[PDB]
Amino acid sequence: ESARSLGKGSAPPGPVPEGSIRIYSMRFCPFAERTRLVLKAKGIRHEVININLKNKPEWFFKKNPFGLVPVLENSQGQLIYESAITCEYLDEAYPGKKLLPDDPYEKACQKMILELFSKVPSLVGSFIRSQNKEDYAGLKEEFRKEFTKLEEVLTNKKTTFFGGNSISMIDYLIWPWFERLEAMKLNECVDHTPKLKLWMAAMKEDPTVSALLTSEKDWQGFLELYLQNSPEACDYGL
Amino acid sequence: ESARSLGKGSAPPGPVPEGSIRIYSMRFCPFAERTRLVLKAKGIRHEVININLKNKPEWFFKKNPFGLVPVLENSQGQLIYESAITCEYLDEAYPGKKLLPDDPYEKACQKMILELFSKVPSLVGSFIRSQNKEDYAGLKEEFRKEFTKLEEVLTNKKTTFFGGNSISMIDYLIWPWFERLEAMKLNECVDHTPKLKLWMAAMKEDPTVSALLTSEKDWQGFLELYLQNSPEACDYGL
Ligand SMILES: N[C@@H](CCC(=O)N[C@@H](CS)C(=O)NCC(=O)O)C(=O)O
Ligand SMILES: N[C@@H](CCC(=O)N[C@@H](CS)C(=O)NCC(=O)O)C(=O)O
C-alpha cells in the first residue's frame, strides 16, 4: 500500500533525501517505465511517488508544468521531465556501465532508431478508438508498418539487440510498448518481423526487464478503469 | 549557381572527402538551418548538397529513408538524419567550444526548453492553412501561447540567451522559426513577451546567425513557389 498514488488534496511531498533521487511515476505508464528501467539497470537508489493521473494533485504542476509523468527530482531540488530526457540524464549523472554508447555516431544511431519507433506510442492510442473487428484489422496493419522499420535495423546489424549484442538504452526506451502488445491482442503484429519477435523474447529474459514486467491481467485491470476516467485506475490492485 | 539543387534524374554524388563532412540541405529549410548554424558556429569544414524537395532524386532515399533534410554524411560513409540529432552529433564529434553544456542537468534543461518550443514548427503549418483575417487572428493567438512558455524561461533565468549569457545549442535550435516570423507577418506575436523580443535582437547580432540569415524578400520568393509545389521553389534566386 506504500505504492498508493497521491492525488487531489494530497500534501506536497518533502525534499528528496541526499543519496536518493525521486521519480514521479504511475505504475502502468509506459513512459515512466522507461525511467524506472534505467534506474534499475544502473542500480540507482531512488524513491517513487505515484501520481493519480485522473485526479492529480495541484502541486504536481509545480514539478512539471506539462503535468505528465515521469518526472525526476533530486536532493538539490532539480526537476527533469520527458522520459527520454530523464533516461539520458540518469545515464550521464550516475555511475556504472553506460547504457548509451560513448561514440558520437553510435549514440546518434540509437536516437535515429528512437525516431523510427516514434509513431508507436500514439498508435497505442488508435487502439483506444478501435471499437470493432474492422477497426482492429486496420489497427494491426498500422502496427505492422512501423514494426517493419524496426525489423530492418535488426536485419542489417544482425545483433541480438538494437544497439548491439548487449542490451542498451534504446532497447529500454522502446520496450514498454512491446510489453503491452499481448494484452492489447496485437501480438500477431510481429509475426512477419521475425527478428523483432526474437528480440521480444530476449528482452523478457533481461534481469531488469523481468524485474519490472507487469502481468497481462494487471494491465487489463488498469485499462478497464483508465478507459472510464476512473479515479481508481492508477491504483489497480491496491 | 554551385548552390543549385539536385533533383530527379541527378547522378548520385561521390564519396565525401576526408577532412570534410557533407550536409544534404535545402537553403530555405529551417530544420537544415539548425545544422548549418552548428557547422558554422563550430568552424566545421563542410560541403553542401541542396535537394529539390518538390522533385527529389531517387537516390536521396538511400541517404535517409524518411526522405527529409537535413542529413549528414561523412568520409566514412556514416549517415545521420533528424536535425537535433545532427546538431548533437556535430557538437560531440568536432573540436572547439561546446554548444551543449557538460553538466547533465543543464544539458537536460536545454532539452526541456526544446520540448517547450516543440509545437512551434507545426504551427508554421497552421500558417499555410490560414487564408483570411479570421484565421490570421486565431493563428497569432496560437503563437502567443507557445511564446509565453519561452518567455517564462527567460524571466526566471534572467539571462541573455536560453542557455545562459552565452549563445548555445538551444538558441540555434529554435532560431530558424523566429527568423521567419517577420516574413510570415507574425512579428506582433512577441509584443507581449518582452524578453523573447530582446532575445531575437541579440540573436541577429550573433556572428553565426548573421552570416546565415535570409532576407524577407528571398524567403517570400521561396514561399510563393513552395505553396504551389513548384519544382523551382528550392532554387529561388538561382
Ligand atoms: N512525452 C512524455 C509523455 C508522458 C506521458 O504522456 N505520460 C502520461 C502517462 S503514461 C501522463 O502523464 N498522462 C497524463 C495526462 O495526459 O494528463 C514523456 O516522454 O515523458
Ligand atoms: N524532424 C525532421 C524534420 C525535417 C523536415 O521536415 N524537413 C523538410 C524540409 S524543411 C523536408 O525535408 N521536407 C520534405 C518532405 O516533407 O517531403 C528534422 O528535425 O530534421
Q: Which of B2, B48, B59 is nearest to B26 (CA)?
A: B48
Nearest protein CA to atom 9 of ligand 2, as residue: B29
Task: Assess whether the C-beta atom of A64 lies below 6 angstroms from ligand 1.
Answer: no
CA distances from B228 to A56, B32, B182, B225, B236 (A): 47, 21, 21, 6, 13
- Which residues are A194's β-sheet partners? none
Our CA-based measurement puts residue A44 at a distance from the nearest CA of chain B, in whole angstroms, of 16
Q: Which of B117, B131, B137 is nearest to B186 (CA)?
A: B137
d(CA B57, CA A176): 37
Residue B160 grid coordinates:
541573455
Q: How was this structure determined?
A: X-ray
Task: Assess whether the C-beta atom of A31 lies below 6 angstroms from ligand 1.
Answer: yes
CATH top-level class for B1-99+215-238?
alpha beta
Strands B21-25 and B71-74: antiparallel
Burial class (CB in 10 A: 0-12, 13-18, 19+), A21: buried
CA distances from B65 to A138, A153, A205, B71, B226 (A): 24, 12, 32, 11, 22
Burial class (CB in 10 A: 0-12, 13-18, 19+), A123: middle
Phi and psi at A164, nearest 5°, equal 145, -160
CB spacing of A88 vs B82 below 8 angstroms = no
- Within 10 Å of residue A168's Cβ, how many Cβ atoms? 21
CA distances from A24 to A7, A57, A227, B208 (A): 12, 12, 22, 40
Expressed in angstroms and rounded, the spacing between residue B169 Cα and the centre of ligand 2 is 19
Chain B residues with beta carbon closer than 8 angstroms to that of A86 = 108
Our CA-based measurement puts residue A2 at a distance from the nearest CA of chain B, in whole angstroms, of 29
Report the nearest atom of ligand 2 relative to the CA of B81. 20
Task: Assess whether the C-beta atom of B83 lies below 6 angstroms from ligand 2.
Answer: yes
List the catalytic residues of A: 29
Task: Assess whether the C-beta atom of A53 lies below 6 angstroms from ligand 1.
Answer: yes
b/e sequence B32-67, b meaning 16+ C-beta within 10 Å? bbbbbbbbbbbebebebbbbbbbbbbeebeebbeee
Domain boundaries of chain B, sorted by first residue: 1-99+215-238, 100-214
- Which residues are A73's β-sheet partners? A22, A79
d(CA B109, CA B105): 6
Strands B21-25 and B46-50: parallel
Burial class (CB in 10 A: 0-12, 13-18, 19+), A103: exposed
Residue B101 grid coordinates:
553544456
A66-69 long-range contacts, Cβ below 8 Å, gap at least 24? A68/A31, A69/A24, A69/A25, A69/A26, A69/A29, A69/A31, A69/A32
Report the nearest atom of ligand 1 relative to the CA of A69. 12
Q: Is there a contact between A36 and A27 (Cβ–Cβ < 8 Å)?
A: no
Expressed in angstroms and rounded, the spacing between residue A62 Cα and the centre of ligand 1 is 16
Strands A21-25 and A46-50: parallel
Report the nearest atom of ligand 1 relative to the CA of A84. 19
CB spacing of A80 vs B105 below 8 angstroms = yes
Nearest protein CA to atom 1 of ligand 2, as residue: B82
Domain A100-214, CATH number (from 3.30.70.100, 1.20.1740.10, 1.20.1050.10, 3.40.50.170): 1.20.1050.10
d(CA B234, CA B50): 8
Expressed in angstroms and rounded, the spacing between residue A84 Cα and the centre of ligand 2 is 22
Phi and psi at A21, nearest 5°, equal -120, 150
Nearest to A85 among B78, B85, B112 (CB): B112
Resolution of the experimentally solved model in angstroms: 1.3
Nearest protein CA to atom 14 of ligand 1, as residue: A68
Chain A residues with beta carbon closer than 8 angstroms to that of B86 = 108
Q: Which of B116, B117, B103 is nearest to B34 (CA)?
A: B117
d(CA B141, CA B158): 25
b/e sequence A50-67, b meaning 16+ C-beta within 10 Å? bbbbbbbbeebeebbeee
Task: Assess whether the C-beta atom of A68 lies below 6 angstroms from ligand 1.
Answer: yes
Residue B158 grid coordinates:
534572467
Nearest protein CA to atom 12 of ligand 1, as residue: A68
Q: Is there a contact between A143 and A136 (Cβ–Cβ < 8 Å)?
A: no
CA atoms within 13 A on the CB side of B204: 12
Chain B residues with beta carbon closer than 8 angstroms to that of A104 = 89, 92-93
Residue A115 grid coordinates:
525516431
Question: Known binder of ligand: residue A71?
Answer: no
Q: Which of A155, A192, A195, A199 is nearest to A177 (CA)?
A: A199
Burial class (CB in 10 A: 0-12, 13-18, 19+), B84: middle
